[PDB]
Amino acid sequence: ASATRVIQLLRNWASGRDLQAKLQLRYQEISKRTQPPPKLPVGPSHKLSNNYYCTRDGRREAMPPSIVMSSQEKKAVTPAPPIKRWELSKDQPYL
Amino acid sequence: AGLLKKTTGLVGLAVCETPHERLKILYTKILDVLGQIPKNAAYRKYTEQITNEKLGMVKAEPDVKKLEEQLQGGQIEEVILQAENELSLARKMLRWKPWEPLVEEPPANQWKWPI
Amino acid sequence: WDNLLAVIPGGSSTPLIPKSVCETVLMDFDALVQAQTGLGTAAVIVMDRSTDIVKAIARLIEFYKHESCGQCTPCREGVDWMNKVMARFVKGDARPAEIDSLWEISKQIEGHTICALGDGAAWPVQGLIRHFRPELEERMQQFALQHQ
Ligand code: SF4
């Protein structure tokens, strides 16, 4: 369906918190279900000049997988530098 | 060394109360098992170039925490694990004989994509 | 002499040139070339200050549309497109962005046609843009103001 103040204390005390500040049941605070007509933006390439596809495409700029050795002293190298150990949290250390 | 680490964080791995000694004897074992492999093998050069430096830092740096940054391998407990794993690989790499030319060329168009 | 606004040195195809360059420039093929135009046929056409350069160019490139061969794609589609856009510029209903696109499609016309008339109609558009771009812009703002 607003609870009587008598049990407002009961639900608040029995759970040790203020339920009425924030409830699971929604109320008039929700956004209106009817909204004004929106005007959506255009993309960065919606330019009527200097928008040639040859300087804008992404698919035709992928090369075949580069070959580095085929079966047809040098320092040891890792695939990537080893990760740096994560630091402990600042907002909330050990729970 | 201070108070020994209560736990390494990861369940399983236990805190090693003899960190440096385990690194030294393990790294010496690496240079041994490598020694049983022909020098021209690339596996020898890279592994010895990796382990002997690691053996160099553990001897030089006596503090555990500074040692962890020295090999950038997390805590010591996972370092002794990796040093153990390199031992098994090096022990198993000598029988596998992975230094001769490849076993054979793959079929003509086994690779190449698209068909 | 001060009443002179622009000169079409030879033929409509060769781009027009403002009086700032018409002070000296010798009437020969090379001299017109560094003057960003050509000698063409030595047909000296002189607009005065009262002349509307935008209107004159639109009339010029409307002639090209009527006398278009029609064979090749650019000179047929592009020049008629040039008519539509340039007619909008003369009235002023266009928007400032479209100035540079007209330049781009003019380059698309240039050198992509079997007939040299396509390049003969792209040059006046380019010449007009390069020498009197503020003229269309203010004329373009005039339309945007009185129409509101
Ligand atoms: S570009 Fe030349 S050949 Fe092609 S349609 Fe125009 S006038 Fe004709």
Side-chain angles (χ1 to χ4, degrees):
Chain A
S2 162
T4 281
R5 137 153 183 281
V6 173
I7 72 195
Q8 295 204 353
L9 262 303
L10 233 127
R11 57 161 74 143
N12 290 165
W13 165 82
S15 165
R17 40 148 56 63
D18 166 325
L19 268 275
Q20 293 273 1
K22 35 187 73 203
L23 319 89
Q24 42 209 324
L25 306 109
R26 333 190 270 268
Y27 276 103
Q28 214 82 324
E29 54 278 10
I30 50 100
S31 164
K32 327 287 280 325
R33 312 299 319 252
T34 314
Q35 316 280 69
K39 157 68 71 64
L40 281 207
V42 298
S45 92
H46 279 56
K47 329 188 259 303
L48 79 76
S49 146
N50 225 355
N51 216 279
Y52 270 79
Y53 210 174
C54 30
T55 81
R56 197 162 37 85
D57 200 291
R59 288 146 67 257
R60 336 274 185 97
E61 291 76 1
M63 263 57 272
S66 59
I67 178 55
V68 302
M69 162 306 295
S70 36
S71 41
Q72 58 83 32
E73 79 301 328
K74 263 159 33 61
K75 323 313 176 198
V77 48
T78 174
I83 43 57
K84 302 318 324 323
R85 39 173 298 84
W86 296 342
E87 301 56 4
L88 226 45
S89 148
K90 330 318 316 313
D91 90 348
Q92 171 132 288
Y94 302 61
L95 260 193
Chain B
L3 174 53
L4 273 206
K5 317 198 313 307
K6 295 55 55 203
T7 165
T8 174
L10 319 95
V11 47
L13 263 154
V15 55
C16 180
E17 75 316 337
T18 160
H20 301 74
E21 309 82 330
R22 286 239 64 190
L23 302 204
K24 292 153 78 37
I25 74 167
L26 268 274
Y27 285 158
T28 56
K29 274 214 191 51
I30 293 332
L31 308 145
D32 160 359
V33 177
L34 298 185
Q36 313 191 38
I37 294 157
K39 204 278 310 165
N40 42 81
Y43 187 57
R44 287 248 301 145
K45 342 189 78 74
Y46 285 93
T47 39
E48 74 88 5
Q49 203 268 358
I50 269 183
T51 282
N52 91 69
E53 313 320 331
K54 294 155 119 40
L55 192 39
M57 338 180 99
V58 54
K59 291 176 314 243
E61 187 41 57
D63 152 37
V64 174
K65 258 58 61 154
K66 194 40 207 81
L67 188 47
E68 319 276 31
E69 263 61 19
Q70 262 324 99
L71 2 108
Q72 38 286 37
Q75 338 183 9
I76 275 302
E77 329 298 325
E78 45 284 61
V79 183
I80 64 112
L81 256 284
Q82 172 45 233
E84 182 310 322
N85 291 275
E86 243 294 340
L87 181 271
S88 289
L89 174 51
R91 158 129 56 250
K92 299 147 83 54
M93 191 144 270
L94 69 88
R95 305 178 335 310
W96 275 324
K97 278 306 291 175
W99 322 280
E100 307 82 281
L102 82 165
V103 288
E104 73 302 22
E105 210 63 36
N109 307 7
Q110 258 279 14
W111 313 128
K112 151 69 46 175
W113 195 236
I115 35 176
Chain C
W1 171 262
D2 301 10
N3 195 20
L4 164 52
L5 186 37
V7 155
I8 323 191
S12 316
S13 285
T14 52
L16 87 171
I17 190 72
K19 197 181 67 116
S20 62
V21 194
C22 311
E23 292 315 307
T24 52
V25 53
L26 267 56
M27 248 195 56
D28 59 86
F29 302 101
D30 308 25
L32 278 314
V33 164
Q34 318 78 9
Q36 292 243 357
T37 178
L39 182 50
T41 164
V44 168
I45 322 297
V46 189
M47 287 67 36
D48 76 325
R49 289 316 299 287
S50 89
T51 336
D52 191 288
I53 296 319
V54 194
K55 209 286 305 169
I57 292 316
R59 179 61 200 82
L60 205 66
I61 62 105
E62 157 206 84
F63 153 88
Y64 280 111
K65 200 279 289 281
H66 291 170
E67 316 305 280
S68 160
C69 152
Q71 226 193 310
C72 77
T73 289
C75 169
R76 178 180 38 70
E77 288 282 68
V79 171
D80 198 6
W81 195 4
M82 277 176 173
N83 258 6
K84 267 134 170 292
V85 189
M86 178 70 23
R88 299 207 285 109
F89 279 126
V90 166
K91 173 58 217 66
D93 62 85
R95 289 285 78 77
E98 306 164 286
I99 294 269
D100 48 42
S101 83
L102 192 79
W103 183 278
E104 303 207 323
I105 78 167
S106 84
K107 213 77 49 57
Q108 301 192 346
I109 296 298
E110 211 155 329
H112 297 359
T113 72
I114 309 154
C115 310
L117 179 143
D119 306 21
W123 296 341
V125 151
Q126 288 142 22
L128 173 277
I129 286 189
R130 84 167 30 90
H131 290 135
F132 302 96
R133 176 162 195 153
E135 160 56 56
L136 318 86
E137 294 173 276
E138 52 106 31
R139 192 108 155 262
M140 174 138 30
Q141 302 328 100
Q142 298 334 285
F143 168 87
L145 256 301
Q146 52 78 25
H147 149 278
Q148 251 348 276

